[PDB]
Design a binder for this molecule. Structure first.
Ligand SMILES: O=C(N[C@@H](Cc1ccccc1)[C@@H](O)C[C@]1(Cc2ccccc2)NC=C([C@@H]2CNC(=O)c3ccccc32)C1=O)O[C@H]1CCOC1
Lengths: 99, 99
């Protein structure tokens, strides 16, 4: 499927047993989801961009279903304004930028 | 061209006669560049990022070349870690996400 950018590229993902809307973000190295609970151990980390830095929790080997596709990778959790799917997971589903 | 996401999708842009590196950022609605001198007048603009909202300077009808593709649009100048090419300009060059 081809996705134009006239509107934010939002898709439905499945994690921890529930569905969520997320933003496909080529400008993000990793994936960050709103504050939630996840099984396993995590490490503190800080990420920054417009507006400053926020503290998140880094989880490894997390299973996430993006557009009915199973991809596994690093997931950050913190006070982000919106769920973001980063390159670390975009590459796994064979997503590319074209023009 | 088709750009894979294993690495950051950086491209060279041409603005004001000089070359610069920028990131193709589908997660950004707007285009934000690091501090620089742009012609004409500006108006205040409040944008929301990962770390909160900030005020930036907005310049309209700016000629920007992206990968040899000419575009004319709104460019915002403010504190940012990288030059960001958002959806407003990505749509002008016919960029899409495919998988
Ligand atoms: O700020 C954004 N867009 C956010 C996404 C977003 C969308 C809506 C609301 C909040 C955030 C994102 O796409 C932009 C950016 C820019 C950046 C590139 C490389 C390193 C540092 C900053 N890319 C990744 C991260 C962040 C932080 N820094 C990171 O390094 C990182 C790593 C993993 C996930 C997310 C990120 C960013 O802040 O949009 C603004 C301005 C343009 O239009 C509106």
């Amino acid at each position: 499927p081809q996705i134009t950018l006239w509107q934010r590229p939002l898709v439905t993902i499945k994690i921890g047993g529930q569905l969520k809307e997320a933003l496909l973000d080529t400008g993000a190295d990793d994936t960050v989801l709103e504050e939630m609970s996840l099984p396993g151990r995590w490490k503190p980390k800080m990420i920054g961009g417009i507006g400053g830095f926020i503290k998140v929790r880094q989880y490894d080997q997390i299973l996430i279903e993006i557009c009915g596709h199973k991809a596994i990778g690093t997931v950050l959790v913190g006070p982000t304004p919106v769920n973001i799917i980063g390159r670390n997971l975009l590459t796994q589903i064979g997503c590319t930028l074209n023009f």
